[PDB]
């Protein structure tokens, strides 16, 4: 099974490399993370939250990564260049709580310690590319808060505030709604916006849980009240649309089973979010997912990473 034949028969094109970001694309990086290496990473649930993590396997570029002390049951895959992923003691060099292995208090953790019990092995720190030393995304202070799109009801537009600050990008938390809310992002969100926006627009604004009479909500008064400052209009940048198409073939990582990269194809677009549709598989399973999020990746990555590839049904 090869991309060239299938593409021949098909009469169909590949998405072009340039059509994604470098990270995506990406394929001479060698992947030096090695099995039982331990380190830092967020909770694909709890996007808040950092942990210990072992490598439990490594594919081509992407590794699996394990909660030490919890089931196997919630391991999941990231690639070699995950900016979600730090090196063991990065969360107390930069102000993050690290919730300890099962069984440990936050009070008796300490990594020199537990590399003795555990005669494990750190991953080197030069091995991830987000370590909190790069340039911060101009204007978003933790502390400061801003309108933003609730990805789990879409229709919604809510209060929130950036709660964190790794390298280029921040978090974004929903006031008073669990951090299950909470996603991660920069300057060209196309899902955040200004103190004000929902007003300009005519659009209704969904205030914080609890927050009496959400109606005449006041972003002057809870402003004050939060001794908190609003992220200024400038620092908010217009990201392009992407320039998918419909129809054109690409490799993406299977939501229901994640080891496994399948063949692919843009069934629908939007400005910033692209339909996978798995090719020969029912539609059911098809998705919609952000234009640069790390799991597409172009025809051929799989190839060129050493990864296996899901040829269609
Ligand atoms: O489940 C819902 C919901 C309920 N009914 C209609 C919609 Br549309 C959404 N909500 C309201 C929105 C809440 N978001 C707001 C900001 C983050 C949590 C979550 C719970």
């Given at each position: 099974?090869?991309?060239?034949?299938?593409?021949?028969?098909?009469?169909?094109?590949?998405?072009?490399?340039?059509?994604?970001?470098?990270?995506?694309?990406?394929?001479?990086?060698?992947?030096?993370?090695?099995?039982?290496?331990?380190?830092?990473?967020?909770?694909?649930?709890?996007?808040?939250?950092?942990?210990?993590?072992?490598?439990?396997?490594?594919?081509?570029?992407?590794?699996?990564?394990?909660?030490?002390?919890?089931?196997?049951?919630?391991?999941?895959?990231?690639?070699?260049?995950?900016?979600?992923?730090?090196?063991?003691?990065?969360?107390?060099?930069?102000?993050?709580?690290?919730?300890?292995?099962?069984?440990?208090?936050?009070?008796?953790?300490?990594?020199?310690?537990?590399?003795?019990?555990?005669?494990?092995?750190?991953?080197?720190?030069?091995?991830?590319?987000?370590?909190?030393?790069?340039?911060?995304?101009?204007?978003?202070?933790?502390?400061?808060?801003?309108?933003?799109?609730?990805?789990?009801?879409?229709?919604?537009?809510?209060?929130?505030?950036?709660?964190?600050?790794?390298?280029?990008?921040?978090?974004?938390?929903?006031?008073?709604?669990?951090?299950?809310?909470?996603?991660?992002?920069?300057?060209?969100?196309?899902?955040?916006?200004?103190?004000?926006?929902?007003?300009?627009?005519?659009?209704?604004?969904?205030?914080?849980?609890?927050?009496?009479?959400?109606?005449?909500?006041?972003?002057?008064?809870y402003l004050e009240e939060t001794?908190?400052?609003?992220?200024?209009?400038?620092?908010?940048?217009?990201?392009?649309?992407?320039?998918?198409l419909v129809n054109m073939k690409?490799?993406?990582?299977?939501?229901?089973?994640?080891?496994?990269?399948?063949?692919?194809?843009?069934?629908?677009?939007?400005?910033?979010?692209?339909?996978?549709?798995?090719?020969?598989?029912?539609?059911?399973?098809?998705?919609?997912?952000?234009?640069?999020?790390?799991?597409?990746?172009?025809?051929?990555?799989?190839?060129?990473?050493?990864?296996?590839?899901?040829?269609?049904?």
């Amino acid at each position: 099974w090869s991309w060239e034949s299938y593409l021949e028969e098909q009469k169909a094109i590949t998405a072009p490399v340039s059509l994604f970001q470098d990270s995506q694309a990406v394929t001479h990086n060698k992947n030096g993370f090695k099995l039982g290496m331990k380190l830092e990473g967020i909770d694909p649930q709890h996007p808040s939250m950092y942990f210990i993590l072992t490598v439990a396997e490594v594919c081509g570029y992407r590794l699996r990564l394990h909660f030490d002390g919890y089931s196997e049951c919630h391991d999941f895959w990231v690639n070699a260049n995950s900016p979600d992923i730090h090196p063991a003691g990065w969360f107390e060099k930069t102000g993050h709580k690290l919730q300890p292995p099962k069984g440990y208090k936050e009070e008796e953790f300490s990594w020199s310690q537990y590399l003795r019990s555990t005669r494990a092995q750190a991953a080197p720190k030069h091995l991830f590319v987000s370590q909190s030393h790069s340039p911060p995304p101009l204007g978003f202070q933790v502390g400061m808060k801003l309108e933003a799109v609730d990805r789990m009801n879409p229709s919604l537009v809510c209060v929130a505030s950036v709660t964190d600050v790794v390298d280029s990008r921040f978090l974004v938390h929903f006031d008073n709604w669990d951090d299950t809310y909470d996603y991660w992002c920069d300057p060209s969100s196309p899902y955040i916006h200004p103190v004000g926006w929902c007003q300009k627009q005519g659009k209704p604004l969904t205030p914080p849980q609890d927050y009496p009479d959400p109606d005449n909500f006041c972003w002057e008064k809870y402003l004050e009240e939060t001794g908190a400052s609003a992220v200024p209009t400038w620092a908010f940048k217009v990201r392009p649309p992407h320039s998918f198409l419909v129809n054109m073939k690409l490799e993406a990582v299977d939501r229901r089973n994640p080891a496994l990269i399948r063949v692919a194809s843009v069934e629908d677009v939007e400005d910033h979010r692209i339909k996978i549709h798995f090719d020969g598989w029912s539609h059911g399973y098809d998705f919609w997912i952000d234009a640069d999020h790390p799991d597409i990746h172009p025809a051929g990555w799989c190839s060129k990473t050493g990864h296996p590839l899901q040829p269609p049904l």
